[model samples]
Target chain A: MPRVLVTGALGQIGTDLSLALRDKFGADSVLVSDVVEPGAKHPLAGLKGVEKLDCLDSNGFEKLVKEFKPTWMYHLPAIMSVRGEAEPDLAMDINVNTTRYALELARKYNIRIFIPSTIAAFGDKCGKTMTKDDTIMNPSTVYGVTKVYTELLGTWYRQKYGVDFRSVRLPGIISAATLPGGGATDYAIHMYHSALLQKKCVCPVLPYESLPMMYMPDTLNSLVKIMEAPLEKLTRTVYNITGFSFSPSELRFSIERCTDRTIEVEYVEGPAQKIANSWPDSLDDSNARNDWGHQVKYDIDMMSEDMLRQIPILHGLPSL
Target chain B: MPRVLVTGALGQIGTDLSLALRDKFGADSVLVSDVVEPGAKHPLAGLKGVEKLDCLDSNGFEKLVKEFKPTWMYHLPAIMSVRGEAEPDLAMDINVNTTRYALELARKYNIRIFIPSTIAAFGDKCGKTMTKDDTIMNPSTVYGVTKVYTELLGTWYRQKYGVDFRSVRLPGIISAATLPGGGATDYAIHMYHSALLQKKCVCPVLPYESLPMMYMPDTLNSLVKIMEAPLEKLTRTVYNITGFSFSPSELRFSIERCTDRTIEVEYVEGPAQKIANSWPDSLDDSNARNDWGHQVKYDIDMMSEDMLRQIPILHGLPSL
Candidate 1:
């Protein structure tokens, strides 16, 4: 049994993945860490977690890795897309520099590293349908540039240094249990909460601007499957994992179908939409499926059902 | 008559262009500016020149432009390929940031801006022959990346702000009048000098690593033609220009035909070859020809004749 260390333990994916790792590897063997304090209601707060590890500080990260001696490392510390756009320099430092530091730690400790990439890697030039694995990539925003470079750097390191690294280019992930972070895709998660509370959601970006999205459970499962796949079988260091594409109007219609209430939606355009529009509408994940037997379990219909059931329970509302 | 300002007055293209501009327009009318003093024996040294104008200083640049009130701006300041590779951050700051500052100045004054791009813009993925006017560009080096972005940013400014920006994607330029700057194609110029001095040359990249190259006279003529072309006729903001392609061995053999002594040739391996390999072997300049009546006068034989005749005289050596 391999000991595992996960950074960004308080993040949406990190909170869930940390608990899953703990369950499989035992609480004592799994070390969860974050730069910020685990708030009282935070998922990792009560658990035995590492509090003072900042991934940006390479020396501190090295010290922590040496102390923990974890064989498996999941590096999820990054500034989300919207925040990255707001503060480009800080985003580059946190997202790019921190990732470089993490790779350094993995090299030193001989750890198997898993980094989660996003569809933010694609740009406007990469058209909507079946965005191929290798295409013209000219990211418009600072966040997208960082993501593309990170994937390239990660692949370079994996090939050159023989450091075991796995990555998945994830689409917008929606979760009812946790509040979404500052990402372009957070609109999808926010819509569900707004619909549950006010029975109406004023959306950002045009309603017809469809983008690929996945539910939380499917995203997590795909991540774990890629990480656990046989190293020899994983031909490409980067994998494109996708879900169904839906517009805000379609989502509103889905919510309306679930409930009789009129979920009024209006587009209040913002910067995030520009970032979203630059990304691919759909990705070709055939390579992911063929290489590591990776498969996404949820589509829009099933995901909507899960969201309807979970949102009410999580927010302590009466069952519909 | 519109006053004109040119940066990088001491550079290979700049030195000659400044002289030509001075002859056409009065010397005082064309203000030549550069960070370095034009070398003592430089033809443009005695002409009207502005010293110590650091293009990176946006404020200073705007102040100078406002004072000069130049209707035409030629932004030629850039760290070339070899230097860019050795000092990437410096290159990015000088090449990219300076262009950003220049664009600001052009926008402020509504000046017709002319920037010279390079063949370095293309990378390994670009096809061998007929590298189309609108092809996928994946530059491998920092210099190439800056050039690609400069062209894109120039086009953006043209479309969005209505700035009259024009550029040419120049192939490698060879000349006998002045030594080439720190570029991937510096070897070609160096070969001429070595043949003149020691009757032999040691090339860095390799023989038969053919790349598109133009004679200095043709380069100057093309620049003037493009600048004078009617705005309506200028369909492409960035046009590809070509001359001829020759391997290192072919170049040395051409020199040997003119030289009396046996010229020893050697190819020492370097990273510049990798950079060269990324560039296209030949360019399709049909667009440039169609749009602006762009033409190249010197093919391999003509360039060789000029190189063999002029280099010895320029260096004050006896003719072979």
Candidate 2:
């Protein structure tokens, strides 16, 4: 049985992904960890979880890895997009310093690390169609800069020290089981909940502002596939995994098609829209497909269907 | 008389450049400032110089600028190539943060600014031969990273705030009057002195590793010319100024042509060679020529003749 540790276990992806890891790797084999204690209302509240492990604390992390002797470590703690800009110094310390510390620990202990990057790594200057494995990055925001640096650091560690690390540049993730937090693309998830409950949603990043997004199921599936793939088969450590690109209006139209209810999404733009425009609308993930037989199952239509069924149930609204 | 402030006044380029500024802008008009006090043996020691003006201290810089009421500022302070790798944090702070502070002061007070960039701005990823003003840069070293970021920040500040700024990506400078410090191309200057004084030279970076280089007089002339050029005629903020590219063996051959002295050249490679290799052998400064009528006066032979005459006199050695 492979022992695995997941950081940021209470995060949007972490919540659902941790549960899946437990199911696949057994409850005893998988260890969930976060900087903060798990809330009583958190989806993984009663599950076996570990707290007080700061990602920046190299000694503590190394101690934990030594004690647990985990086969794999999943690092997901980071200062997200919006908060990164507001507090750049803290962001640099938390985001960059922590990743460096993790790589150092991985290099020292010979740990196979699984880190998640984001489309935030791409900036306004990048090409329209982003390639999964291309490393031409000039990130605009501090968060994006941190992510790009992490990818490079990972590459360096792997080449120099032979650390087996795998990473995915995740797109905007939409999940009915978990609430999004702090990211620029959280508006995608928020709009779905708002439409189900209020019939009209005030979109923060406006309509027709196309951005790459992935449904929750496909995100989990891709993560599992990449993690399970043989080390020899994985040519690139960082893979750009994407599903669909759609605007708020397009999303609302799909929701309306699923339900007879007159759902409307109002474009009350926020600061995140400027950030959204800076990112690529769609990513070319052919490298991911070719390397490890990676595939995404959620199209816009499939995502709308899943959201319409699950979001209403999760939010305590009547299932149409 | 135009008042000018020079930062990093103690550095290789800064020290010599400050003296030239004092000559052109008047000794009192050129306010020389550096983190460290002007060294006792520094070339600018006898000139009118200001002390304790920290570039990192924004308020202090602003205050100094207000008191000096300078019309132009030649911001030359930066951590050079070899030293930057050993101390990255200091490099980023001095190179990037100091430049940001300088730009802010220029923007607030509307002072004309002149900054000297280096060939380190280019990396291995950038194409060889006729390296254009605008090229793809993926710098592996800390010095290159800081230089590239500084250029971007300077350009951004100039465009956004209408700050009258000009810059040149200078090649390696060979000078007999001053000792080169913490630069990869320092060998170009050192070889001349060693050949003239000891009839032998131990080269640090590999010989046969060709790189762009310029003589001291031409370098000083170029700096003064760019600073004095009309803002209307200066179309580009950053200009690539090419000099002569020579391998270590080629430099030895050039030195032998001037004298029958059998100067022994030995290669004792250092980390600087890796940094130098990343830079381009030549630069395309067609824009600089077309826009501001920029031209080079020294080739390898001309520089060899000048070095043969000047090095012996400056070092108090036998003049051949």
Candidate 3:
């Protein structure tokens, strides 16, 4: 049985990923932790083990790692790009230090660690092309900077210490159960929520500013696939894992089609828009597919249908 | 007059570079600091300001920056490649944190900062070719990894904060004044020293493993050139700078030519050999030349002549 431990377990990806891990490896086998405690009725609140873990607190983190003796660790806590801009120092501290601590723990405990990278790792210099795995990474934001650092350092830990470290350059993940973190792609999630609530979606980016994105299911599935991959089959520590790319306007139209009703969007310019503009329109994740047989089940249309359908049902809203 | 502040003032490049700055900017106009205090007889001892300031100590570093009110900062303290391999955490901490502190200081003081990237910043995947400015930087060593992070972060500081940050991707610097920090390219300096002392040079890397190199004068000159270049003229934050590329055998031949003695060399394989193998054979510095009008004063022959002539005279030995 794979003993799994997840940091930032209350975050968007972690919330769903923790449940998925528990489904595969029994709830007792998975340990989910976060700096923030969950509400009484939260999905993770009922887990076999849910504890507060400030990853920056080395002593506290190591104590959990020592006791849990987890075989796999998912380090998912991060100050997203938008939030990172507001507090770059905090972002750098949390994103970078936590990664180093995790790598150190993974080295000490013989754990297979999964650290996620992002498409934000690329700069405007990367252009709007299919960003290959080995593209020149000159990230623009502090969040992107730290993720690039994490990917590089994680690779270093793997090469230097023989620690099984794997990472994916995830796109903006769209999740139904959890609210989107403060990322450039949060507009995609907001569009769904606003449409379901019969309210206007005040998008923070230009209508045509497309960015690479992945549905949460695809994101969750790919993480497990990479973790389960044979060591020899993995050529690189970080692989670009993405599902599809869509602009706000395209997403709005898809949501309208799925609901058989018109969706309103109010585009506004902000820092998130600039950040989204800096990222790639799409990524060439051929390496991920070839290395670990990565596959995505949802396209923009399918994702729209699923997201619209799932949100209302999960959140106690009337079905569209 | 430039009020300059240089960290890591006692290192190889820092020692000579400090003198050159003092000569150009006046001893009173420059502040030189290091983690270690120089000897009483050291050249920096007579400088207007020579103090022990650990770059990792943020409070101490910030206090120095506040008092100096520097117009230019040469952030040179770093754990070199071989040394970094021994203490990866220390290298990452010092090389990375010091840079962040300097950038923060630069932003606060409106100081133009110069950080240096190295040939080691490239991995074996960069190949033994004339590496362009924007090649894929997947560094193999912790030192190289830190440098890549430095370059990226320096560029980010320039873009986001409008901080006047500049860097040069330097080759293996050959100096006559001080010994190199533990880097793979130290063999070039070792070959010269061994030749001067009438001793056989035991080279660590293969004879034909050519790596880019620059004389100390060239290194110093390029640092000033990049620092002095108009910000608008700089196409990018980090520019590759090199004088020439020579193998261990090529350097021995040059040393023999300069001394008119048959210099013997013994090759040995070690960790440094692998590190050297991972770096580029040469770098294309055309962008630097065009942008900042970068000019190197010496190639292998001239560097060998200068090294052979200067070492004996500087150290009170018989003239070559």
**Candidate 1, which segments miss by more than 4 Å at Cα?**
A1-124, A138-169, A177-184, A221-239, A260-262, A267-279, A312-319, B1-9, B20-35, B41-48, B53-117, B145-167, B221-239, B257-262, B313-318
TM-score of chain A of each: 0.95, 0.95, 0.98
- DockQ (Cα-based) for each candidate: 0.15, 0.18, 0.77
Off by over 4 Å in 3: B317-319
The true-versus-predicted C-alpha distance at residue B202 of model 1, in Å, is 1.8
* Clash-forming residue pairs, model 3: none
TM-score of chain A of 1: 0.95
Q: Residue-pair clashes per candidate, as listed?
A: 0, 0, 0
Model 3 per-residue lDDT at B7 = 93
User: What overall lDDT, based on C-alpha atoms, would model 3 receive against the true structure?
Assistant: 0.89
Give the higher-lDDT candidate: 2 or 3: 3
| CAPRI class of candidate 1 | incorrect
Task: Give interface RMSD (Å), model 1.
Answer: 4.7
For each candidate in turn, the TM-score is 0.78, 0.82, 0.98
Q: Higher-TM-score candidate among 1 and 2?
A: 2
